[PDB]
Design an enzyme around this catalytic site. Structure first.
Site, PDB file in Angstrom:
ATOM      1  CE  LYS A  29      -3.702  -2.376  -0.151  1.00 27.85           C
ATOM      2  NZ  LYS A  29      -4.761  -2.268  -1.204  1.00 27.85           N
ATOM      3  CD  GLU A  52      -9.683  -4.806 -11.456  1.00 27.91           C
ATOM      4  OE1 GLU A  52     -10.570  -4.510 -10.601  1.00 27.91           O
ATOM      5  OE2 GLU A  52      -9.657  -5.896 -12.126  1.00 27.91           O
ATOM      6  CE  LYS A  54      -1.965   2.037  -2.705  1.00 28.91           C
ATOM      7  NZ  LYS A  54      -3.373   1.679  -2.883  1.00 28.91           N
TER       8      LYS A  54
HETATM    9  C1  FMN Z   1      -7.183  -7.193 -10.384  1.00 23.94           C
HETATM   10  C2  FMN Z   1      -6.797  -6.498  -9.080  1.00 23.94           C
HETATM   11  C3  FMN Z   1      -6.924  -5.122  -8.937  1.00 23.94           C
HETATM   12  C4  FMN Z   1      -6.546  -4.525  -7.715  1.00 23.94           C
HETATM   13  N1  FMN Z   1      -6.663  -3.133  -7.564  1.00 23.94           N
HETATM   14  C5  FMN Z   1      -6.274  -2.486  -6.430  1.00 23.94           C
HETATM   15  C6  FMN Z   1      -6.334  -1.048  -6.314  1.00 23.94           C
HETATM   16  O1  FMN Z   1      -6.775  -0.345  -7.235  1.00 23.94           O
HETATM   17  N2  FMN Z   1      -5.916  -0.489  -5.122  1.00 23.94           N
HETATM   18  C7  FMN Z   1      -5.454  -1.296  -4.107  1.00 23.94           C
HETATM   19  O2  FMN Z   1      -5.087  -0.817  -3.044  1.00 23.94           O
HETATM   20  N3  FMN Z   1      -5.414  -2.683  -4.249  1.00 23.94           N
HETATM   21  C8  FMN Z   1      -5.790  -3.268  -5.396  1.00 23.94           C
HETATM   22  N4  FMN Z   1      -5.723  -4.687  -5.456  1.00 23.94           N
HETATM   23  C9  FMN Z   1      -5.183  -5.412  -4.270  1.00 23.94           C
HETATM   24  C10 FMN Z   1      -6.254  -6.403  -3.721  1.00 23.94           C
HETATM   25  O3  FMN Z   1      -7.261  -5.789  -3.001  1.00 23.94           O
HETATM   26  C11 FMN Z   1      -5.633  -7.499  -2.855  1.00 23.94           C
HETATM   27  O4  FMN Z   1      -5.149  -8.342  -3.894  1.00 23.94           O
HETATM   28  C12 FMN Z   1      -6.615  -8.349  -2.018  1.00 23.94           C
HETATM   29  O5  FMN Z   1      -7.169  -7.670  -0.891  1.00 23.94           O
HETATM   30  C13 FMN Z   1      -5.883  -9.634  -1.611  1.00 23.94           C
HETATM   31  O6  FMN Z   1      -4.838  -9.250  -0.724  1.00 23.94           O
HETATM   32  P1  FMN Z   1      -3.251  -9.546  -1.025  1.00 23.94           P
HETATM   33  O7  FMN Z   1      -2.995  -9.156  -2.486  1.00 23.94           O
HETATM   34  O8  FMN Z   1      -2.371  -8.874  -0.022  1.00 23.94           O
HETATM   35  O9  FMN Z   1      -3.036 -11.038  -0.856  1.00 23.94           O
HETATM   36  C14 FMN Z   1      -6.056  -5.297  -6.646  1.00 23.94           C
HETATM   37  C15 FMN Z   1      -5.977  -6.671  -6.800  1.00 23.94           C
HETATM   38  C16 FMN Z   1      -6.338  -7.217  -8.005  1.00 23.94           C
HETATM   39  C17 FMN Z   1      -6.170  -8.690  -8.108  1.00 23.94           C
HETATM   40  C1  BER Z   2      -9.658  -6.393   5.338  1.00 24.41           C
HETATM   41  O1  BER Z   2      -8.570  -5.653   4.958  1.00 24.41           O
HETATM   42  C2  BER Z   2      -8.739  -5.435   3.610  1.00 24.41           C
HETATM   43  C3  BER Z   2      -9.322  -6.220   2.633  1.00 24.41           C
HETATM   44  C4  BER Z   2      -9.489  -5.911   1.307  1.00 24.41           C
HETATM   45  C5  BER Z   2      -8.926  -4.706   0.977  1.00 24.41           C
HETATM   46  C6  BER Z   2      -9.019  -4.317  -0.317  1.00 24.41           C
HETATM   47  C7  BER Z   2      -8.453  -3.059  -0.602  1.00 24.41           C
HETATM   48  N1  BER Z   2      -7.847  -2.201   0.317  1.00 24.41           N
HETATM   49  C8  BER Z   2      -7.777  -2.602   1.597  1.00 24.41           C
HETATM   50  C9  BER Z   2      -8.315  -3.873   1.922  1.00 24.41           C
HETATM   51  C10 BER Z   2      -8.200  -4.229   3.269  1.00 24.41           C
HETATM   52  O2  BER Z   2      -7.727  -3.790   4.542  1.00 24.41           O
HETATM   53  C11 BER Z   2      -6.408  -3.266   4.623  1.00 24.41           C
HETATM   54  C12 BER Z   2      -7.334  -0.870  -0.083  1.00 24.41           C
HETATM   55  C13 BER Z   2      -8.149  -0.266  -1.151  1.00 24.41           C
HETATM   56  C14 BER Z   2      -8.478  -1.245  -2.241  1.00 24.41           C
HETATM   57  C15 BER Z   2      -8.642  -0.824  -3.551  1.00 24.41           C
HETATM   58  C16 BER Z   2      -8.920  -1.818  -4.484  1.00 24.41           C
HETATM   59  C17 BER Z   2      -9.011  -3.169  -4.176  1.00 24.41           C
HETATM   60  C18 BER Z   2      -8.860  -3.592  -2.898  1.00 24.41           C
HETATM   61  C19 BER Z   2      -8.574  -2.612  -1.967  1.00 24.41           C
HETATM   62  O3  BER Z   2      -9.304  -3.909  -5.298  1.00 24.41           O
HETATM   63  C20 BER Z   2      -9.724  -2.937  -6.244  1.00 24.41           C
HETATM   64  O4  BER Z   2      -9.160  -1.691  -5.855  1.00 24.41           O
END
Ligand code: FMN
Ligand code: BER
Ligand code: FMN
Lengths: 216, 216
Positions: free
Chosen positions: B13, B164, B73
């Protein structure tokens, strides 16, 4: 390493039916399916893991007609994974995901859980309401899982091949997926290749980076 | 080993802008992009790899409006990969693909090359004509690449986050993608996390297999 894995893995064209995954490898491939990332941690997927002769035969039915060339791979591999996507994103699934993150300890306060749910719903709503492309959005997450999976099992020393050449309507009907809310997307046999695997000896081929890649 | 990687990797993050990829690492991430599999080896993709301040700032324009939470990021990571899909599958690309496989030594005879081209067209035609789902099909191959990529860079010991949450219209316009035949799908900053990455210590959360996985 991983770069050697990426440069050495290949799509297996024939599997040796006498060679099964170890029971520990069978657990590990399930761990890879589960722990792939996904947008919003939405995890909009279901997996069918067929390791019995009866189970593989039900999957292999979808490799009929134009797709008979894939039938042997699904029958002869040790384990066959069917990757399925949700057909619709419902608010009960959204509740399941945020509650599981809470049970796992990802929220310090109930206000952080609420904010996490609200953020997830903004994306789900964008896809369900404004764009009406949620089915494609979730399928994309499933393909991302497949890519994670193919590298992961190669790194485990397992052969595999991804398969789109199959009849998804027959596969869905065979497993009752439409009523349960899912549709099949990619079939991945995993196991060990045979002497019949003509692709195991061919050089890998990819277009050069001067075509596909721009540095800035 | 790869299972440890899968269980320990995370979506970063916040990045430390002072911690750059090594020269070998910068080449290795491009190898991961190039060597991903895809349906029919169609490789329907383009990558933008931004590593200069100006280049990252240009990608980061797409994280405006609702998406400002992803903008830092893109600015702070060492490298930012933009994954793009082709907007249409044209027969000039199909020819490039089979000619490359020919150049790499995959066809024993001109009849094998011609047989490879014919099958690739059967699938390409099925999508562009019968299904009219050509763009979605190639976009799925890009997501597969992303899934491969995320696991690879983690296995290399690099931090990353798939994104995304960006405006693809702005990104496409910033880099002239529409006119060149591509559209942006996901942005992946790669580098090393900073102390402000609140996600680096949180436990990973996934749904239980008794919901997502069926054994047969
Ligand atoms: C296709 C895709 C798009 C994502 N877009 C964002 C995003 O725009 N911002 C963000 O903080 N995380 C984004 N994520 C991170 C996901 O939320 C994260 O993969 C999910 O919570 C699973 O946690 P981990 O990747 O730490 O295992 C994205 C993940 C995927 C797979
Ligand atoms: C439960 O903790 C979670 C679980 C899921 C999380 C998923 C996401 N974030 C924190 C999360 C978080 O906590 C830190 C940050 C913002 C974000 C933007 C995204 C995304 C996933 C997330 O996919 C598309 O764009
Ligand atoms: C019937 C059949 C279906 C296939 N379907 C897919 C697919 O849906 N997606 C995919 O990424 N690869 C698929 N492949 C394998 C690709 O052709 C292969 O990944 C590509 O040529 C690159 O080769 P490699 O996988 O050995 O590196 C399939 C192969 C066969 C024989």
């Amino acid at each position: 390493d991983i770069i050697s894995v990426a440069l050495k893995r290949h799509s297996t064209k024939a599997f040796d039916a006498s060679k099964k995954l170890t029971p520990e490898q069978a657990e590990q491939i399930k761990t890879l399916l589960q722990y792939s990332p996904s947008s919003t941690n939405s995890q909009p997927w279901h997996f069918i893991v067929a390791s019995t002769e009866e189970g593989k035969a039900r999957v292999a039915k979808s490799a009929a007609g134009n797709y008979v060339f894939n039938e042997r791979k699904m029958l002869d591999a040790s384990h066959v994974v069917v990757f399925c996507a949700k057909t619709a994103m419902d608010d009960v699934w959204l509740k399941l995901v945020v509650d599981q993150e809470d049970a796992d300890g990802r929220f310090a306060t109930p206000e952080a859980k609420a904010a996490n749910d609200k953020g997830r719903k903004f994306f789900a709503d964008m896809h369900r309401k404004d764009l009406h492309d949620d089915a494609e959005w979730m399928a994309k997450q499933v393909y991302l899982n497949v890519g994670n999976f193919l590298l992961g099992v190669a790194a485990l020393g397992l052969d595999a091949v991804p398969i789109e050449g199959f009849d998804a309507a027959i596969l869905d009907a065979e497993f009752g997926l439409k009523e349960k809310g899912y549709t099949s997307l990619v079939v991945v046999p995993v196991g060990h290749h045979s002497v019949e695997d003509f692709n195991a000896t061919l050089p890998k081929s990819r277009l050069p980076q001067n075509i596909t890649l721009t540095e800035v």
